[PDB]
Amino acid sequence: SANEDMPVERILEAELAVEPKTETYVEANMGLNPSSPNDPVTNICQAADKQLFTLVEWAKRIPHFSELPLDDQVILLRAGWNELLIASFSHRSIAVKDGILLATGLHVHRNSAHSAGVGAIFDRVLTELVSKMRDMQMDKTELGCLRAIVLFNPDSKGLSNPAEVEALREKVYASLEAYCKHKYPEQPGRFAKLLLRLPALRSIGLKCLEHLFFFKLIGDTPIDTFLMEMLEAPHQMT
Amino acid sequence: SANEDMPVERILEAELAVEPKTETYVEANMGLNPSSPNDPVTNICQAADKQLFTLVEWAKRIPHFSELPLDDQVILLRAGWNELLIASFSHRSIAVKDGILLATGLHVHRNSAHSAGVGAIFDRVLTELVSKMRDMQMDKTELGCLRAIVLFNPDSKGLSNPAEVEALREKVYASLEAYCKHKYPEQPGRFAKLLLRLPALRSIGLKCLEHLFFFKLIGDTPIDTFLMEMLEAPHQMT
Ligand SMILES: C[C@H](CCC(=O)NCCC[N+](C)(C)CCCS(=O)(=O)[O-])[C@H]1CC[C@H]2[C@@H]3[C@H](O)C[C@@H]4C[C@H](O)CC[C@]4(C)[C@H]3C[C@H](O)[C@]12C
Ligand SMILES: C[C@H](CCC(=O)NCCC[N+](C)(C)CCCS(=O)(=O)[O-])[C@H]1CC[C@H]2[C@@H]3[C@H](O)C[C@@H]4C[C@H](O)CC[C@]4(C)[C@H]3C[C@H](O)[C@]12C
Ligand SMILES: C[C@H](CCC(=O)NCCC[N+](C)(C)CCCS(=O)(=O)[O-])[C@H]1CC[C@H]2[C@@H]3[C@H](O)C[C@@H]4C[C@H](O)CC[C@]4(C)[C@H]3C[C@H](O)[C@]12C
Ligand SMILES: C[C@H](CCC(=O)NCCC[N+](C)(C)CCCS(=O)(=O)[O-])[C@H]1CC[C@H]2[C@@H]3[C@H](O)C[C@@H]4C[C@H](O)CC[C@]4(C)[C@H]3C[C@H](O)[C@]12C
Ligand SMILES: C[C@H](CCC(=O)NCCC[N+](C)(C)CCCS(=O)(=O)[O-])[C@H]1CC[C@H]2[C@@H]3[C@H](O)C[C@@H]4C[C@H](O)CC[C@]4(C)[C@H]3C[C@H](O)[C@]12C
Ligand SMILES: C[C@H](CCC(=O)NCCC[N+](C)(C)CCCS(=O)(=O)[O-])[C@H]1CC[C@H]2[C@@H]3[C@H](O)C[C@@H]4C[C@H](O)CC[C@]4(C)[C@H]3C[C@H](O)[C@]12C
Ligand SMILES: C[C@H](CCC(=O)NCCC[N+](C)(C)CCCS(=O)(=O)[O-])[C@H]1CC[C@H]2[C@@H]3[C@H](O)C[C@@H]4C[C@H](O)CC[C@]4(C)[C@H]3C[C@H](O)[C@]12C
Ligand SMILES: C[C@H](CCC(=O)NCCC[N+](C)(C)CCCS(=O)(=O)[O-])[C@H]1CC[C@H]2[C@@H]3[C@H](O)C[C@@H]4C[C@H](O)CC[C@]4(C)[C@H]3C[C@H](O)[C@]12C
């Protein structure tokens, strides 16, 4: 266990860098200061784009990640994006109840996901991840370290050097325990409690891929506001 | 962290109780001392039955499990059987190479699984679990504690008291760390390395359910030996 090879402060920085601005959260949910038009395709493409940025800007800021062969960096991001995205929108949603806050600042309510056909996956996110993170008062350093552990997956298919990725993973969890021990001495089993949210992240990630949850999650509100305009507009042709 | 509420010795006992006898391994693979006939249905039903016994006899021997409401005991076994079964046949296969040893003592070779249509799931078992367990020289106490952590899943749907199951889970991993620390002081990050095999167990378990891997794994050899007899028998009707 050591913090020099994997500083938790440098891991917290990576998480803070990609954190949405307060103005993003406010604008999205008030419909204010739109850059974007009421076109569903544009809005979906912009949301996907903002999510990709969050994952890539975060990863590059993780210690030693950019020292891996570029081929391995692509494989790790492509193999873990689903889980990385889920862990990120789960922790961001701790303050909110019955909903998810996306990288665009948008709040997707439980009800919208239930009418969208993704209700059960959404409830698994709320229950298995969001509630659990809120109860332990999981901090952004802990999230950061959980996400770097997901990132540094030595089991990803196609890696040139799996031993390097595995050595990088070990350092993250060695720093995570040192951090947990020093900040939460009253909680001796917190490190395990954190690592034990990863199997749920794994199953949820697979279930999201099978149901087009990412597509429906980012596509639902843009479809609603577009239809709202058409329904609110006056009578048309013939 | 404490061993009185969850003794690792009592957890090792549970694993040892359900461990196949040497005579089972020898008889299965030599075709010797058959109780069973060359009927595929009987052989599949007997294998499923032996696997169920292993899971139930193991669980009852786990400290405090039988003190949970009986309704919760059923839910925990039904929710985690797939993962419990996989962790069990993975560790049993450490000594063998390119194959899996079942509770019936039977050795299913990689090649048979490839011709059966389950090749990729089988290779994931060999690579993600079997190899990893063999490299760390994972002991039966460690396996036992990993399996009780899977057993005591507080996220299972329908539990009357999820807090009790979660409290039981915490004790297992508290004992597991104390064990790891005391037996492997040269390996300070072993406890994490062990807990980090659980997300792979989770994904593999889901993939096994979607491809009828348990059905095909136990059904393949009984179908082969039945067809072998028919093909080896002399010419028949008209
Ligand atoms: C005070 C808090 C945040 C605290 C903070 O962190 N403050 C840094 C500077 C805040 N901003 C980044 C928004 C400045 C934008 C300058 S920009 O050049 O980008 O327009 C900010 C964040 C978003 C702001 C609201 C939204 O805007 C929507 C709306 C626009 C109207 O018109 C005026 C009213 C209203 C309700 C705003 C009030 C207030 O002010 C809010 C709540
Ligand atoms: C801000 C206003 C609501 C104001 C309001 O009506 N506020 C008082 C409520 C108080 N109550 C009567 C409930 C009593 C509370 C008692 S209690 O004790 O329970 O607190 C709400 C009502 C309809 C909302 C829009 C639509 O959705 C469509 C769209 C969805 C997107 O996603 C975000 C953008 C957008 C344009 C939304 C923006 C905004 O969000 C609107 C204007
Ligand atoms: C565009 C309309 C406003 C009504 C309208 O139809 N107004 C005319 C066009 C306005 N424009 C600014 C595009 C003009 C540009 C001219 S220019 O020549 O500069 O291109 C506004 C009002 C509510 C806005 C949505 C919500 O917030 C929720 C959500 C937040 C995400 O974060 C981005 C996606 C999404 C779906 C938002 C999209 C868009 O933002 C909406 C539909
Ligand atoms: C109909 C409601 C106002 C009614 C109200 O009081 N909202 C309180 C919340 C309670 N509900 C949502 C249940 C009310 C439903 C309608 S009810 O008839 O029940 O009141 C108003 C308030 C804000 C309005 C949107 C924004 O301008 C942005 C955007 C501009 C585009 O150019 C056209 C589309 C869009 C999405 C607009 C649609 C619609 O025009 C909204 C939702
Ligand atoms: C010495 C080792 C295991 C060491 C051990 O743990 N020894 C405890 C007693 C062993 N058994 C449980 C098998 C006794 C069965 C008594 S029973 O009443 O169940 O038949 C035992 C385990 C299984 C035994 C083989 C198989 O049988 C198949 C075969 C049957 C023939 O005929 C004789 C040859 C052969 C190759 C056997 C030789 C030997 O002996 C083996 C390898
Ligand atoms: C024990 C004998 C093989 C003996 C043998 O032929 N032994 C010498 C090999 C030495 N070599 C020539 C390979 C050189 C090694 C050089 S090296 O340097 O590589 O070591 C093998 C050959 C065919 C096998 C059966 C069938 O499968 C069907 C069935 C499958 C079930 O699942 C288990 C039961 C059963 C009845 C099997 C039992 C047993 O298992 C048999 C009789
Ligand atoms: C039954 C045949 C032997 C040839 C035959 O067809 N022999 C006549 C019948 C013999 N019986 C003992 C059933 C008579 C009982 C009379 S009584 O009146 O008592 O019912 C034997 C030889 C090889 C044996 C398989 C392999 O090992 C692999 C595997 C191990 C598992 O662990 C159990 C399943 C499986 C598929 C085994 C089933 C069965 O075991 C086989 C086919
Ligand atoms: C054909 C082979 C022997 C040939 C040999 O030398 N085995 C070495 C291994 C190498 N191979 C598997 C590639 C050889 C394939 C056949 S080859 O023609 O290439 O030799 C022999 C050896 C043991 C025999 C089984 C047992 O009695 C149990 C059982 C009794 C039932 O009543 C009928 C079914 C069954 C499954 C029997 C089938 C078959 O009769 C086996 C596999």
UniProtKB/Swiss-Prot annotation, chains A, B:
The modification Phosphoserine is found at S35, S36. The keyword Ubl conjugation applies. Expressed in lung fibroblasts (at protein level). Expressed in monocytes. Highly expressed in liver, also found in kidney and brain. All-trans-retinoate binds at R92, A103. It is found in: Nucleus; Cytoplasm; Mitochondrion. One of its GO terms (biological process) is hormone-mediated signaling pathway. Acetylated by EP300; acetylation enhances DNA binding and transcriptional activity. Residues 124-144 are annotated as: Required for nuclear export. GO terms for molecular function: DNA binding domain binding; DNA-binding transcription factor activity; DNA-binding transcription factor activity, RNA polymerase II-specific; double-stranded DNA binding; enzyme binding; identical protein binding; LBD domain binding; nuclear receptor activity. Keywords: Acetylation, Cytoplasm, DNA-binding, Host-virus interaction, Isopeptide bond, Metal-binding, Mitochondrion, Nucleus, Phosphoprotein, Receptor, Transcription, Transcription regulation, Ubl conjugation, Zinc, Zinc-finger. Induction: Down-regulated by aging. Induced by pulsatile shear stress. One of its GO terms (cellular component) is nucleus. Residues 3-234 form the NR LBD domain. 9-cis-retinoate binds at R92, A103. Transmembrane segments: none annotated. Homodimer. Heterodimer (via C-terminus) with RARA; required for ligand-dependent retinoic acid receptor transcriptional activity; association with RARA is enhanced by pulsatile shear stress. Heterodimer with PPARA (via the leucine-like zipper in the LBD); the interaction is required for PPARA transcriptional activity. Heterodimerizes with PPARG. Heterodimerizes (via NR LBD) with RARB. Heterodimerizes with NR1H4; the heterodimerization enhances the binding affinity for LXXLL motifs from coactivators. Interacts with NCOA3 and NCOA6 coactivators. Interacts with coactivator FAM120B. Receptor for retinoic acid that acts as a transcription factor. Forms homo- or heterodimers with retinoic acid receptors (RARs) and binds to target response elements in response to their ligands, all-trans or 9-cis retinoic acid, to regulate gene expression in various biological processes. The RAR/RXR heterodimers bind to the retinoic acid response elements (RARE) composed of tandem 5'-AGGTCA-3' sites known as DR1-DR5 to regulate transcription. The high affinity ligand for retinoid X receptors (RXRs) is 9-cis retinoic acid. Composed of three domains: a modulating N-terminal domain (AF1 domain), a DNA-binding domain and a C-terminal ligand-binding domain (AF2 domain). Belongs to the nuclear hormone receptor family. NR2 subfamily. This is Retinoic acid receptor RXR-alpha. It comes from Homo sapiens. The gene is RXRA. The chain holds residues 225 to 462 of 462 of the full protein.
